[PDB]
Amino acid sequence: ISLP
Amino acid sequence: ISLP
Amino acid sequence: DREQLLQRARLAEQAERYDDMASAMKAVTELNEPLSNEDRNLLSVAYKNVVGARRSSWRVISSIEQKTMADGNEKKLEKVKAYREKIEKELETVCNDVLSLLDKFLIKNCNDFQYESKVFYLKMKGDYYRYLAEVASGEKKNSVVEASEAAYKEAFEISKEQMQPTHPIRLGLALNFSVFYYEIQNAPEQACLLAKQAFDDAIAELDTLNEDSYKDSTLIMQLLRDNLTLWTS
Amino acid sequence: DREQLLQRARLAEQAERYDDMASAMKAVTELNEPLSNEDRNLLSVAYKNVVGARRSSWRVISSIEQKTMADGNEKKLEKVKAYREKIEKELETVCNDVLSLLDKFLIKNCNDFQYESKVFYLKMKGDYYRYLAEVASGEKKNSVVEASEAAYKEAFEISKEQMQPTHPIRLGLALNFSVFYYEIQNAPEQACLLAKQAFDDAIAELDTLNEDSYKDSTLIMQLLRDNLTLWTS
């Protein structure tokens, strides 16, 4: 999960 | 709601 | 090549690239050869997603235009109107492409006896004229409303004549046609009675249910039911 | 005109017309004037959604192409390879558009003193080089992997010099910088360490949370934690  |  | 195009549409669908998908199925249609059931559903799915993005976009930007009127911000309303209108011409262009496919190949090249395809294409003509009506104004609105209802009427006449009450294409026609009455013609009673007659008529004849489509029949029966309980209550 | 192009981006965002949003913000950027915080995020959102669509499509067709290789269907694998490549070229074009905005205007025009901007933009350079790296091969992969690391590394040093550890931008850079190590470099320990240090430096300094960014800071601390729990397990 990378930054939304 | 119409047909999907 | 037809199989090339159909493989592309399938890949596009999975990729959720619905313009690629609509573009491949338009090319299939323009081969002037009949579509199978599965080919038809690929055409329908592609254009449903394409037009649907524009319909959604349009409802968002109409809401804002209403909230801008109430605000009194006249400068903002000018640009919000212009963008709504930009989205509108896109939406209209997609509907007009579909309708032209129907008119120039699909319904044209249908013989009398291809009743399953005929109903499917006329409902589809009913559907896209209904999407034009959603955003039409004035004399244009009354023309596309009239065309939607005439298409739906013919489709439904043929379907009662040639299809069992449980055939999903008949049930889905009944479904969309009731929604025409409900939200386009604002005939709540006419809408309700049409959905109610199709539901009743399907359960009277449950014995007609089919190994390859029973799930879809019962699916759409529930959707008739849902609108009924929503509308009546 | 800048008001016009920016208004359009706001409306395009609401309508989820992200290509329209990206085109409007590319134009705003091409005026060669600085971007406010609001503007910057508009650009970032537009392009995150444009490239994200392509990335999602790319992953789905890559999975099909792997299954078609093992199935041994050479004729279809020809067609899936080609489509995956059509999507790649699309993806690469969006990334190089973004990377040219950054290199030609946004990073270029940063003062030696506009630290918040620089970090934001160098993070962005790392992100899009990383998205290129997700699909790249051979020597082209090496180059974009090094490019990604070099931009993340500069961004992170400035952020440690000039930003509090609870700053959302510094935290999200730490987040994406750790992800880059984990999934681009296959360096899970190096990824975990940098993530852990970030979470740890933030917690040491909760006294630096601000009214207008505490929620975003805490959100991103939890994402760092989420990744470390997945990765350590």
Distance between CA C212 and CA C208 in Å, rounded?
12
Within 8 A of A2 by CB-CB distance, chain D residues are: 127, 175-176, 179
Task: Look at residues D4, D38, D42, D11 and name the one whose alpha carbon lies nearest to residue C64.
Answer: D11
Residue pair D57/C17 in contact (Cβ under 8 Å)? The answer is yes
Q: At what angle do helices C74-101 and C37-71 cross, to 10 degrees?
A: 160
Place of tokens 């959720």: C16
Q: Which residue of A has its CA nearest to D221?
A: A3
Residues of A in contact with D127 (CB under 8 A): 2
How far D14 CA lies from chain C's nearest CA (Å)? 7
Contact pairs from chain B to chain C, CB under 8 Å: 13
Contacts of C56 (CB under 8 A, 6+ apart): D15, D16
DSSP state of D206: G
D64 contacts C8? CB cut-off 8 A: no
User: D226–A2: do the CB atoms touch at under 8 Å?
Assistant: no
Q: The tokens of D2 are what?
A: 């800048």
Q: Tell me which of C56, C175, C184, C217 to substitute to probe the interface with B (most B C-beta atoms closer than 10 Å).
A: C175
In 3-state terms chain C splits into helix, strand, coil percentages (rounded to 5) of 85, 0, 15
- Alpha carbon distance D105, D116 (integer Å): 16
- Sequence-ordered list of residues with C-beta below 8 angstroms from that of C130, at least 6 positions apart, any chain: C148, C176, C179, C180, C184
> Contact D81/C41 with Cβ under 8 angstroms?
no
Q: What does the alpha-carbon distance between residue C169 and residue C177 come to, in Å, rounded to a whole number?
A: 12
HSE (side-chain half, CA atoms, 13 Å) at D70: 5
User: Over the range D203-223, which residues count as b (16 or more CB within 10 Å of their CB) and which as e?
Assistant: eeeeeebeeebeebbbebbeb
B1 vs C contacts (CB less than 8 Å): 179, 223, 226-227
C-alpha C70, offset from chain centre: 33
Region for D32 from its dihedrals, namely left if φ exceeds 0, alpha if ψ lies in -120 to 50, beta otherwise: left
Token couple for C153: 């009427």
Contact D35, D43 (CB under 8 A): yes
Q: Which region, left, alpha or beta, applies to residue C16 given φ > 0 means left and ψ of -120 to 50 means alpha? A: left
**Helices D18-29, D74-101: crossing angle, 10 deg rounding:** 40
Q: Is D88 exposed, middle or buried (0-12, 13-18, 19+ CB in 10 A)?
A: buried
Q: Give the closest residue to D131 by CA, choosing from D150, D147, D118.
A: D147
User: If interface means Cβ-Cβ distance under 8 Å, which residues of chain A face chain D?
Assistant: 1-3
Instruction: Delimit the domains of chain C by residue range.
Output: 1-233
Q: Do chains B and C touch (3 or more CB pairs under 8 A)?
A: yes
Rounded distance between C-alpha atoms, residue D91 and residue D199, angstroms: 32
At C110, is the secondary structure helix, strand, or coil? Answer: coil
Instruction: Residue D81: name the closest of D137, D148, D139, D128 by CA.
Output: D137
Backbone angles phi, psi at D25, to 5 degrees: -75, -30
| Token duo for residue C213 | 């489509």
| CA-based nearest residue to C121, from C137, C138, C102 | C102
> Resolution in A, one decimal?
2.2
Residue from C125, C189, C199 nearest C155 by CA: C125
Chain centre distance of CA C228: 19
d(Cα C118, Cα C115) in Å, to the nearest integer? 5
Beta carbons of D217 and A3 less than 8 angstroms apart: no
Q: Is C172 on the interface with B (CB under 8 A)?
A: yes
> Do C39 and C6 form a contact (C-beta atoms < 8 A)?
yes
Using DSSP, state whether C136 is helix, strand or coil: coil
The pair of structure tokens assigned to C91 is 């939406």
Residues 6+ apart with CB under 8 A from C119: C155, C156, C158, C159, C162, C163, C169, C170, C173
- The answer to whether residue C222 neighbours chain D at the CB level (below 8 Å) is no
Chain-centroid distance, C-alpha D212: 23
Token pair, residue C38, equals: 């599965």
Report d(CA D155, CA A3) in Å as an integer: 15
Residues, chain A: 4
Q: Do chains D and B touch (3 or more CB pairs under 8 A)?
A: no
As a whole number of angstroms, the distance between CA C160 and CA C198 comes to 10
Q: Do the chains contact at D61 and C15, CB–CB below 8 Å?
A: yes
Nearest C-alpha in B relative to C229: B1
Q: Decide if D103 contacts D118 (C-beta within 8 A).
A: no
> Does domain D1-233 fall into CATH 1.20.190.20?
yes
Selection from D216, D213, D171 nearest residue D195 by Cα: D171
Torsion D28-D29-D32-D34 (CA) sign: positive
Q: Round to the nearest angstrom and report the end-to-end CA distance of chain A.
A: 8
